[PDB]
From Swiss-Prot:
This is Angiogenin-4. It comes from the Eukaryota. The active site is at H11 (proton acceptor), H111 (proton donor). The keyword Nuclease applies. Detected in small intestine, caecum and colon, with the highest expression in Paneth cells in the intestinal epithelium. Its EC number is 3.1.27.-. The chain holds residues 26 to 144 of 144 of the full protein. It is found in: Secreted; Cytoplasmic vesicle, Secretory vesicle lumen; Nucleus, Nucleolus.
């Protein structure tokens, strides 16, 4: 399932290290989100079984197209240094523990809603 794959590439990291600014710049480059520099991108930590579970019992409908988790997830948000999308993409990290909102397709996560955790 490629759509599921793109999701894990852009939003998943089981065991992170540092979770600081340097973690974001390295990660965004490694996961290919610097062409162009993605504005905001969040990585979810933990296991993958719990993320897909949000598409099942451990989740609830959040509108017509999304699901919200029944429990919080450890997450790291990488925000672009809005200014200079040139090859060097600047980022700063922000660690949080929140309930998340994803989009599911046939039982698999396919999209992460960044605006839900803006506040």
């Amino acid at each position: 399932n490629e759509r599921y794959e793109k999701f894990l590439r852009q939003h998943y990291d089981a065991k992170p290290q540092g979770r600081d600014d340097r973690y974001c710049e390295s990660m965004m480059k490694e996961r290919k989100l610097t062409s162009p520099c993605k504005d905001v991108n969040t990585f979810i930590h933990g296991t993958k079984k719990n993320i897909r579970a949000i598409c099942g019992k451990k989740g609830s409908p959040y509108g017509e197209n999304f699901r919200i988790s029944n429990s919080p997830f450890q997450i790291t948000t990488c925000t672009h240094s809005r200014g200079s999308p040139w090859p060097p993409c600047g980022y700063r990290a922000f660690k949080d523990f929140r309930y998340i909102v994803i989009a599911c397709e046939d039982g698999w996560p396919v999209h992460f809603d960044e605006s839900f955790i803006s506040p």
